[PDB]
Structure 1
């Protein structure tokens, strides 16, 4: 009931989670997810990112790292805890490690 998990990522990432049973339409026919394609621009990602951050029914957001870099300024601008944003490796992009939001919050972590 309480909170949904929003996903902003590539075609396979979103498809996988949707099969995972996560994601749904609100009463306004809005989807708590975005598929980011090669033709998707920065304003589209940022607008979606912001709407999830300002949407009180979301909370955890799952994004691809390569996207995290594309709109990275928005990831440090918001410092809260409901909107926990987790950065994941895309099907082909390589495993994340550096530029983790948390490793930045705490500079004492491997």
Structure 2
């Protein structure tokens, strides 16, 4: 209820998750998501990420792996409990199995 999950991924992730149960337009007619394409650059990904961070009703952020690598500095610099950022691979992109900050902050793991 209180929070609305955001998504930042290539077309197949976005269309799959919108049918999945999530996604929303606020009263201001603003997407809580973003479809990335090959033409997308880093700055607007960063801008939307920060806009979501300031948006109180995000809660949980799901982003693709390579997108996270585009704005890795934004993830590492920002440290808070509320914005639960995640990492998911796309269909053609291989499995994500490392370089996750949540594992990095717990260095004592494997």
Considering the TM-score relative to the shorter chain, is it more than 0.5? yes
| Aligned partner of residue 69 in structure 2, secondary structure | helix
Query: Please, which runs of 5 or more residues in structure 2 have no aligned partner?
Result: none
> Which residue in 1 is equivalent to 2:14?
14
Q: RMSD value over aligned CA atoms?
A: 0.7
Partner Cα distance (1:53, 1:90) in 2: 23
Deviations 1:43-87 (A, max 9, x none): 110001111111100010000010000010000111111100001
In the TM superposition, residue 97 of structure 1 has moved relative to its aligned partner by 1.4
Q: Which runs of 4 or more aligned residues in structure 1 lie more than 2 Å from their structure 2 counterparts after TM superposition?
A: none
Deviations 1:10-49 (A, max 9, x none): 0000111000110010010001000000011111100011
Count of aligned pairs:
110
Q: TM-score, normalised by structure 1?
A: 0.97
Q: TM-score, normalised by structure 2?
A: 0.97
